[PDB]
Amino acid sequence: PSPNLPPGFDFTDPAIYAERLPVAEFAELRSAAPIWWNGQDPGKGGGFHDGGFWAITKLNDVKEISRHSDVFSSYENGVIPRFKNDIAREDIEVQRFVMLNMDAPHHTRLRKIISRGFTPRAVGRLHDELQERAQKIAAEAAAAGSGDFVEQVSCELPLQAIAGLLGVPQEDRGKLFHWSNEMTGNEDPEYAHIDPKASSAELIGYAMKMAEEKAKNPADDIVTQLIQADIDGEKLSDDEFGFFVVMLAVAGNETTRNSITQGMMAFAEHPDQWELYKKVRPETAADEIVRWATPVTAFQRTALRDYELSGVQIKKGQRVVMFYRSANFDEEVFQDPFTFNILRNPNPHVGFGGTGAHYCIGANLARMTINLIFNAVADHMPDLKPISAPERLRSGWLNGIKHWQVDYTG
């Protein structure tokens, strides 16, 4: 029995996500075809011209793919499964210069080096400044009376976390945030004029200057740890540091932002959970917010060899797309997946990916950012009420909220 889906339905179609999350359609796949060939017509593959991909809708399958990086490659086609339909292949392949889109051994070396900058100690060192900034952000928003929650509450703290972790001087944080904002969303009419190429080039230029500077003047950020050689001589070259900064500027911005906005939309829809949150401030809330928000709807891999996955024969060269948005609501794994439960524990969501070589190195920074902002929102605008519907982002792989007017005072 084929799944009950519109003909030609494409789970990476940005026009879907500009309007809604295709929740019923994912549930239909989990029930009727949990691994399903998602065909794509010529010219309508979001930059990929291979006729389609396998949709992976079950959490255990997402985990199996993520564990078997020796078979399922990030490098061959990158992990983003949708660009503009006319993107040039060469512009896909430049994604291979960042860790995210690298296979072992190149990935292994870089991840080892980069891990020096995401130690528990490094991230914990940011806690107090980010807590102060969260309080001020929420205080300033509450003072404005009403406004765009996305811009006045969700946007700033993730960017300040990247700035603090890298040690970007305050006067440069405006340009850092601009470069970060120019790298995402170019398929949405609101961002049709952003130039991700120019911004990445400018950011690499900035980052290599910083690398050269912080090498002369060792400062207690992660940068020194990254560009000073270890016993084996291992370190990021200046351009590798630049590629890392580009990666972090993209990774550390919109996904956490959209977690915050959709977490508050969930609280607005589930007032008992919001009352419980305000009273107890459970940090398990962060992971339920990430599960509920699944800010990365999907990442892909490419099979390097034939591989049988839950009874389906995957062929060498085919893409598989891990729909984290489906896996995070998998009825076989979660009890009442469509209940928003901020006490859910354990919460084995794949919002940060499946465990494996490419598991999100920023997961605990994101969780901290989320816990700190919602504490500040509870402290300063406990009674906020939405004014109108969120405006969703046109993207085939990011679950984004562009705008959401709320009354911070109720």
Ligand X SMILES: O=C(NCCN1CCOCC1)c1ccc(Cc2ccncc2)cc1
Q: Report the binding-site residues for heme.
A: 360
Range in contact with ligand X (rule: CB under 6 A) among 16-24, 110-118, 239-247, 313-321: 239-247
| The entry of ligand X, Cl ion, ligand HEM, none that residue 95 binds, CB within 5 to 8 Å by partner kind | ligand X
Give the one residue of 5, 223, 251, 293 binding ligand X; rule: CB under 6 A: 251
Q: Is 321 in the site for ligand X (CB under 6 A)?
A: no
| The entry of Cl ion, ligand HEM, ligand X, none that residue 207 binds, CB within 5 to 8 Å by partner kind | none
DSSP run (H or E) holding 320:
strand 319-323
| Least separation in angstroms between CB 248 and ligand X | 8
Q: Is 56 in the site for ligand HEM (CB under 6 A)?
A: no
Q: Rounded to an integer, what distance in angstroms lies between the CA atom of residue 378 and that of residue 408?
A: 11
Q: How many Cβ atoms sit within 10 Å of the Cβ of residue 318?
A: 18
| Least separation in angstroms between CB 310 and ligand HEM | 19
Decide: helix, strand or coil at residue 254. helix
Q: Rounded to an integer, what distance in angstroms lies between the CA atom of residue 65 and that of residue 300?
A: 10
Please report, as residue ranges, which positions from 151 to 190 form the binding site for ligand HEM (by CB under 6 A): 162
Q: Do 43 and 74 contact (CB within 8 A), yes or no?
A: no
DSSP run (H or E) holding 183:
none
Q: Rounded to an integer, what distance in angstroms lies between the CA atom of residue 232 and that of residue 209?
A: 25
DSSP run (H or E) holding 399:
none
Range in contact with ligand HEM (rule: CB under 6 A) among 248-256, 267-275, 311-319, 379-387: 248-256
| Least separation in angstroms between CB 122 and ligand HEM | 11
| Least separation in angstroms between CB 175 and ligand X | 17
Cβ proximity to Cl ion, 80 vs 290, nearer residue: 290
Range in contact with ligand X (rule: CB under 6 A) among 94-102, 133-141, 227-235, 331-339: 94-102
Decide: helix, strand or coil at residue 407. strand
Q: Are strands 405-407 and 385-386 parallel, antiparallel or unpaired?
A: antiparallel
Decide: helix, strand or coil at residue 200. helix
Contact characters 188-227, ligand HEM, x per CB under 6 A: ----------------------------------------
- For residue 306, what are the contacts with CB-CB under 8 A and spacing of at least 6? 313, 314, 315, 316
Q: Is 399 in the site for ligand HEM (CB under 6 A)?
A: no
Distance in angstroms between the alpha carbons of the first and the last residue of the chain: 49
One-character DSSP codes across 263-315: HHHHHHH-HHHHHHHHHH--THHHHHHHHHH-SB-EEEEEESS-EEETTEEE-
Q: Is 344 in the site for ligand HEM (CB under 6 A)?
A: no
Range in contact with ligand X (rule: CB under 6 A) among 90-98, 140-148, 259-267, 272-280: 90-98
Give the one residue of 360, 370, 372, 376 binding ligand X; rule: CB under 6 A: 360
Contact characters 98-117, ligand X, x per CB under 6 A: x-x-----------------
Annotated binding-site residue numbers for substrate: 185
Report how far Cα 157 is from the mean position of its chain's Cα atoms: 15
- Secondary structure tally for the chain: helices H, strands E: 18, 12
Closest CB to ligand HEM belongs to which residue? 362
The sheet with strand 319-323 has its strands ordered as: 35-39, 52-56, 319-323, 298-303, 72-73
Q: Rounded to an integer, what distance in angstroms lies between the CA atom of residue 359 and that of residue 353?
A: 6
Give the one residue of 361, 373, 393, 406 binding ligand HEM; rule: CB under 6 A: 361
Cβ proximity to ligand X, 95 vs 160, nearer residue: 95
Range in contact with ligand X (rule: CB under 6 A) among 20-28, 160-168, 249-257, 284-292: 249-257
Q: Is 97 in the site for ligand X (CB under 6 A)?
A: yes
Q: Is 398 in the site for ligand HEM (CB under 6 A)?
A: no
Q: Do 183 and 195 contact (CB within 8 A), yes or no?
A: no
- CA distances 68 to 61, 147, 309, Å, are 11, 45, 11
Question: What residues make contact with Cl ion under the rule CB under 5 A?
Answer: 334-335
Question: What residues make contact with ligand X under the rule CB under 6 A?
Answer: 80, 94-95, 97-98, 100, 200, 243, 246-247, 250-251, 255, 360
Question: What residues make contact with ligand HEM under the rule CB under 6 A?
Answer: 66, 74, 79, 99-100, 111, 162, 247-248, 251-252, 255-256, 259, 290, 295-296, 299, 351-353, 358, 360-362, 365-366
